[PDB]
Design a protein around this ligand. Sequence first.
Ligand SMILES: NC(=O)c1ccc[n+]([C@@H]2O[C@H](COP(=O)([O-])OP(=O)(O)OC[C@H]3O[C@@H](n4cnc5c(N)ncnc54)[C@H](O)[C@@H]3O)[C@@H](O)[C@H]2O)c1
Ligand SMILES: NC(=O)c1ccc[n+]([C@@H]2O[C@H](COP(=O)([O-])OP(=O)(O)OC[C@H]3O[C@@H](n4cnc5c(N)ncnc54)[C@H](O)[C@@H]3O)[C@@H](O)[C@H]2O)c1
Ligand SMILES: NC(=O)c1ccc[n+]([C@@H]2O[C@H](COP(=O)([O-])OP(=O)(O)OC[C@H]3O[C@@H](n4cnc5c(N)ncnc54)[C@H](O)[C@@H]3O)[C@@H](O)[C@H]2O)c1
Ligand SMILES: NC(=O)c1ccc[n+]([C@@H]2O[C@H](COP(=O)([O-])OP(=O)(O)OC[C@H]3O[C@@H](n4cnc5c(N)ncnc54)[C@H](O)[C@@H]3O)[C@@H](O)[C@H]2O)c1
Ligand SMILES: [Zn+2]
Ligand SMILES: [Zn+2]
Ligand SMILES: [Zn+2]
Ligand SMILES: [Zn+2]
Ligand SMILES: [Zn+2]
Ligand SMILES: [Zn+2]
Ligand SMILES: [Zn+2]
Ligand SMILES: [Zn+2]
Lengths: 347, 347, 347, 347
Amino acid sequence: SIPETQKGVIFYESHGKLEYKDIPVPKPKANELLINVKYSGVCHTDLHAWHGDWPLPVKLPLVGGHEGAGVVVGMGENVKGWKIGDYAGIKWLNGSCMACEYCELGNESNCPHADLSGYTHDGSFQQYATADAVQAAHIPQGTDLAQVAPILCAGITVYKALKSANLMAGHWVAISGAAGGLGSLAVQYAKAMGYRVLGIDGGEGKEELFRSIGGEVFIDFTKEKDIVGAVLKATDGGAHGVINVSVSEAAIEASTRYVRANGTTVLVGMPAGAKCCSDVFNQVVKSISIVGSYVGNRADTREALDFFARGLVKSPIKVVGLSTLPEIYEKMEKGQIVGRYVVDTSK
Amino acid sequence: SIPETQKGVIFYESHGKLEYKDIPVPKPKANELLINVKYSGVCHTDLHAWHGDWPLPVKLPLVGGHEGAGVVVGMGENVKGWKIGDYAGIKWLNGSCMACEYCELGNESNCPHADLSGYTHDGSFQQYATADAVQAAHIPQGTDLAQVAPILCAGITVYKALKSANLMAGHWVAISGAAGGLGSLAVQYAKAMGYRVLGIDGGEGKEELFRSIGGEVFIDFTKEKDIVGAVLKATDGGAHGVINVSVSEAAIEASTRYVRANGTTVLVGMPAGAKCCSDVFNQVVKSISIVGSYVGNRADTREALDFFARGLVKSPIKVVGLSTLPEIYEKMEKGQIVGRYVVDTSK
Amino acid sequence: SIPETQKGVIFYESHGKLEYKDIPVPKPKANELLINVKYSGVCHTDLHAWHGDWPLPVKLPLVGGHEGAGVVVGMGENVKGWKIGDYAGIKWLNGSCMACEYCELGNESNCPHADLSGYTHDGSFQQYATADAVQAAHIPQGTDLAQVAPILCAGITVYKALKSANLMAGHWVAISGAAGGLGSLAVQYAKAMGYRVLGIDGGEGKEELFRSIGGEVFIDFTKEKDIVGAVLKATDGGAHGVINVSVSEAAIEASTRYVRANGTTVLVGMPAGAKCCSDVFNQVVKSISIVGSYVGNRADTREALDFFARGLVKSPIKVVGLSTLPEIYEKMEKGQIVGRYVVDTSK
Amino acid sequence: SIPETQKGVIFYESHGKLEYKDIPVPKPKANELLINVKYSGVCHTDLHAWHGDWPLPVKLPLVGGHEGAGVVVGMGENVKGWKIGDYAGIKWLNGSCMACEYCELGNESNCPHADLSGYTHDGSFQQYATADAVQAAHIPQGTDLAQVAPILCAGITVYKALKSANLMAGHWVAISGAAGGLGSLAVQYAKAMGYRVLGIDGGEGKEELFRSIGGEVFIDFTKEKDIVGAVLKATDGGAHGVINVSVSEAAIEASTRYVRANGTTVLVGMPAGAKCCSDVFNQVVKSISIVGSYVGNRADTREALDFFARGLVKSPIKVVGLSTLPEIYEKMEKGQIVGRYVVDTSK
Ligand SMILES: NC(=O)c1ccc[n+]([C@@H]2O[C@H](COP(=O)([O-])OP(=O)(O)OC[C@H]3O[C@@H](n4cnc5c(N)ncnc54)[C@H](O)[C@@H]3O)[C@@H](O)[C@H]2O)c1
Ligand SMILES: NC(=O)c1ccc[n+]([C@@H]2O[C@H](COP(=O)([O-])OP(=O)(O)OC[C@H]3O[C@@H](n4cnc5c(N)ncnc54)[C@H](O)[C@@H]3O)[C@@H](O)[C@H]2O)c1
Ligand SMILES: NC(=O)c1ccc[n+]([C@@H]2O[C@H](COP(=O)([O-])OP(=O)(O)OC[C@H]3O[C@@H](n4cnc5c(N)ncnc54)[C@H](O)[C@@H]3O)[C@@H](O)[C@H]2O)c1
Ligand SMILES: NC(=O)c1ccc[n+]([C@@H]2O[C@H](COP(=O)([O-])OP(=O)(O)OC[C@H]3O[C@@H](n4cnc5c(N)ncnc54)[C@H](O)[C@@H]3O)[C@@H](O)[C@H]2O)c1
Ligand SMILES: [Zn+2]
Ligand SMILES: [Zn+2]
Ligand SMILES: [Zn+2]
Ligand SMILES: [Zn+2]
Ligand SMILES: [Zn+2]
Ligand SMILES: [Zn+2]
Ligand SMILES: [Zn+2]
Ligand SMILES: [Zn+2]
């Protein structure tokens, strides 16, 4: 019934060959779900873990991926709150000691023993994966496993970020990078949560797309020469919260100048070796807050997933084969980052 | 090394004999600590579980107790954040599904599958007990295991309660029942947390004891005929928060009338079949809040335990033998509830 | 310029005969505005005042009303941020000391010196009345004064209570009396603020109205044997918040038992001599919260009016004569108002 | 009655010559008090004003000072809650519009119409000055005006920042420049509010002073090679909060890296043209918060003065002549002030 062999996209070296091939089916432990993965999300994070850019050592031979949507096929004796057949979601955060200051506060991310899918643990580019029964998303029955896989990283994240911005219904939120993978989700979660949405992005088509998902006010950065000035103009003081999901330092630092007084600019985008250098006078005189926001926790997960379940949030995906993958890892270099890729494991 | 037999205080019937006798050493599971219990707290809750007053069915044959302080002697393969020798604490809340709305928010108490020490699971009146590795308190090395056992229920609880009152340093807090088991801990946690402490209790000696642990203002309920009036007088508006830890309905309802406007009265004491009947006009006109507060969670635990570790909180205990116990269960009826009892398991 | 005699509805002794008749125009004090009142909402508070339903005495003879919208025709020597001609709003809280701890913190309505329109200060049921300038709603030019009127007590009250319930977009809120004046506006503020809306009401066209305004789940109190269990089942475990905007004791009572674990019932409705009786055991084990909420502050007001301007809230009104007041009270006290009545002061 | 000429310290052009000399007594406006100023603290802000260190221009010629304590000798026609003879306190925020969204919410100091003592309005470095009545600290009778003076900017500022750091009793707070004017008072407000206090400073008798006032852990910046790692080790993983009350860029910088995970660095200190440069990767992965805090509001003020009255805070002062001001600025800008200087206006 459960096979011993399966297909996966492994690699035997830091920045080396990307062999799609037959590998073992991993056994699960007493705390783990055996998940038959149907679709795996794909984003730039999986390109970095491959290279060895981040300095934490990598678990070679390693199956990347951290956005797996699938089905509970087996489980360790001690697993709880899980039936066979349940739909299960594998996130960046695979596991945690569950016995430290941080793990107790739902800040399992900052756990010194953070187990990470597609990095220290074998991720979601394979037909069968193990996961911690606790951290695994509980996907409700009747949800397109393809469509949801993007929610499992970018969606949780942008939702958590949005709570962290610390807003009320009726407040303005600026999404800096609002036609991007993260931006366009941010825009929908923002709208569903009661907020007024202004947006910043550039060039061909990105404005019509923004409107078509409920954005109110667009600031074309290519045409508009004084971004701050318009943002202030448009919000009659400056945006109450701000989400930074561009890949541009300039645009982050701009954020400290268009955010409102008593307001909160939030860091999600982590451009390579970037630094946010805010003027101290401005920041004190206006009691401005600058908050970083990492992945989410079990609660954030459940919530983020309910808006999707309510149909209030959707990702414009496009599905390709799991054997295809090296091309995608290749295209991510070449520049053809463009829309949300998801991988079928049957192919 | 680890024995197969040990002593424990069991019972084979709802409200029956209380045989101190040799019983098995339980095996632990993969998620559990084997704890060699050195001292167990004792309170009225353990008297109720015995009778069958609470309507949830009881796990006969059952070893009561929910305040165990001891030592990690073994552990299941999958346990994490636990070394052998570590000091471990067994609480009312033994375990939880760790996969529901509530378990994800640190409200494991309200879990439908709440596993409870000294009720559905075998508690802390025995030399060796099993516990969930996750929920178990991590007691720091160099803490009197005798002295701490009271912290594991009344202390966590009164601390959690105090946060729930939702106060600032410099605000007044009223402890209603401030020379009692819970009251006198409440008084110390209150002081350590920055609050100004007023107190209410009655009769022989209870005022000198109150002062001797840092209480500012005492209202003798036996002498003072208009409690509300004095409390208002003394706080120049009414106490900002209030803790109810008396065993008296009258005194709870009094609380809704001496609590300040915008303030918060908190329910901890659960007198048998009692009801809090607040005047609706008063409560609206003054935006008063009435909050129930159950046991604490892993975080509350760690925090509560740090003040003890800092020596800022102490319980006037008195140690007796584990064989003694039926007498104590007997004395709790007879009326000789009087000071904090703790049980040595070597006796 | 400004006339001397005017039309008002006045009552000379408690529960007296409502007299529609020529009366003095009032003189503004130095901090006060005179306001030509054009329309005013009719609130159940006003009925409770006419009936003598609350402990506080009225100021006889009394002109009730505190949902009054009008223009500035005059003002006192000391008034700051207002021109003659502006639109102004007269609410429950006429004014306050803006100088004690409560007023400092925003809780202006809990000022022990609070002056109340339509109870201790002749309110808005007349063509000319006065209001303190610092607490008076600034209403944007080109606002329909007949339509805006009910935001000034119904709308801000319920908006503030909703913030007081500690909800999150996605959560369930139960609205007890969801087709009343406050209820109907609660439903819209709740929809707009990202919550899922359940409501309880009864009588002709109530459900019909609830559905038209954005209501998800209706429970007719006329048909449903088990209110409590129906809310439980609908919410799948209890409503995260509840807003009591009935005029009923048994409603209030039940909201203590259909609230969710870690949920919050907000008291708002003030039936005569009514009391909230909550089982202590239950409130404590579930850590349920019970909170009274009292109108809104300047900020709440600002915010509540902005939702209106955006077209997201809309009190269902019928505009009749000020001389028609007795028919409104007659028909209010029989359940039969469906939303709100406002009075044209010229008729 | 009230004199015409008085003694003041005045400067005519930026960074000019400080002139101690006979000058007009000022006339109160209708909402303003005249205050006989007896003593005033000397704050580094005043130095930054004299030097022209910030973007905002001064109001030349300027009498600095905004820690001024005095009695009411007169007031305007429109003043409400004050008698002649009362004690009054003149702070940074002279007054504000008490009528925009910011002022409505408590954030009075972020009013775009804010009037500033000792920058845009002749402050407290003279025997007579004026202040808006609604924002002026009410100081209890029998308060030592020389001693209370520094609460009026140092003390409330640091107390408000501490609330802005989101601490809990038990948590660690690092105070950067803990032996300065603000630092020394921060240390006491922190002790009183239940926090464990670490501080960083340097120069003669600084450590000595830090220990006398309740400091737990000192780090001399003069001796310690590794500031960052020393804070990390002391806190066992980072300070839960940090308060930047230095006048240094490199201090600020380091507070971004010795803050705890999910911790909060509060910006307060305003070195000229200074900037806060935080590594985005780090801020995000740890979800660190960076927050500016700007003086205090009426409520903060009230609260901060109450700590004083209870004897739990005490600025270490030395009282010299108002004509001595240049020696204070001379010695402030060399690190050498140990706590605070206040000026006797009569000398
Ligand atoms: N915080 C976390 O936990 C977390 C998790 C995963 C990924 N990420 C990060 O998310 C980031 C963004 O990913 P993405 O796929 O959304 O990017 P993307 O390339 O799909 O979109 C980026 C968008 O930013 C826009 N942009 C460029 N310059 C701009 C400017 N000056 N102002 C406004 N917009 C501008 C682009 O036009 C584009 O629409 C990455 O840096 C990645 O590291 C963060
Ligand atoms: N919320 C929870 O999670 C939780 C957990 C465990 C126990 N409890 C409860 O704690 C309660 C108290 O236990 P205890 O051992 O502290 O009681 P105790 O008998 O030791 O002390 C009660 C005190 O209340 C005083 N008292 C009596 N009438 C009073 C009045 N009118 N005003 C003020 N004080 C008055 C007594 O004089 C006494 O000092 C019990 O009802 C128990 O069920 C609650
Ligand atoms: N706390 C505050 O700040 C505040 C502010 C304004 C009004 N109020 C009070 O709120 C109450 C409601 O005011 P209104 O003017 O909206 O009243 P209203 O009479 O216009 O509407 C009351 C609604 O309650 C409903 N109701 C009756 N029995 C019920 C039951 N068993 N369950 C559920 N609903 C039931 C009615 O059908 C009706 O639609 C009054 O007591 C009023 O004084 C309080
Ligand atoms: N944000 C606000 O609301 C607010 C309010 C008042 C003052 N301030 C500002 O705060 C700053 C401090 O004010 P003050 O009057 O207390 O200053 P002060 O000069 O009296 O004290 C400054 C302290 O910083 C210390 N210091 C110097 N180098 C340091 C280093 N590398 N690390 C740590 N500490 C160091 C000094 O030794 C000194 O004790 C000023 O810039 C002032 O303008 C801000
Ligand atoms: Zn991803
Ligand atoms: Zn951990
Ligand atoms: Zn107990
Ligand atoms: Zn659970
Ligand atoms: Zn007041
Ligand atoms: Zn009303
Ligand atoms: Zn203002
Ligand atoms: Zn200052």
